[PDB]
Amino acid sequence: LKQVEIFTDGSCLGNPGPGGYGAILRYRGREKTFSAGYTRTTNNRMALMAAIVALEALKEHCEVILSTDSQYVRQGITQWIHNWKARGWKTADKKPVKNVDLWQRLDAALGQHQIKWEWVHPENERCDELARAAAMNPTLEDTGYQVE
Template sequence: MTDPARTDLVEIFTDGACSGNPGPGGWGAILRYRGSEKELSGAEPLTTNNRMEMMAAIVALEALTRPSQVLLSTDSLYLKDGITRWIHNWKRNGWKTSDKKPVKNADLWQRLEAALETHRVSFEWVRGHAGHPENTRADALARRAIARTQEPGIRIQDGDPPEA
């Protein structure tokens, strides 16, 4: 018998990748709901691995069309710990770390927090590159997205490299 509490669960599997850090980066996400799946991916010409990990989660959550119970699986402890442990102190300290430095990627932490507002989200860490099928698929989506930035006709924007 199916557990009714899990019937309406949205499972999200995310990964980010970067070719150089900073460098061209991509993210991938798989959303699973009631046996159906949707794949999402994207890339940026100059970014960091941490930003791509965050973008995968943000875009996946923003793609949900109604308030949902979510289990988000990531191989990024930076993402998981940042949103479940560190963000509360960052906000209390005016987006500064404990040593009074600006929080890296504050723009994305704020966007992620906003994306979480209408959902009940649990974060699960999975070991990357250890045979977890959905993590492997999300990584492949991210890497394919990076490859698209290398295709002729893709304009690479000038600018300073983003923070790690």
């Protein structure tokens, strides 16, 4: 299957506050760029978005090496995402899980490809800049964010 590399990064001026994401999809040379800024969001939601958008842009089952420094994403993937699904997406108290709208989208995207996560670079530097640039020029509302 096609081999591709994805780089991502989220950024937020507050918690919550204006934020943005930056992601890069690379296929043997070619490179696709993604970024958007939201008026009020969190670094966590932006970190997920960056991964979600790049992955959903894929049009076939791919072998993906996904790089992200978000420890929030790292946890969900290596720990929470498993339990959540085995409970109809609910916390330990049968209560809804935060950012379920994004975690579900990320979970769906993961089921589409064979993902190898790199929890760690010149490539990620651009994403950081795209994300910061988006956070400084928000153009959309992050409806999925539940205030406070």
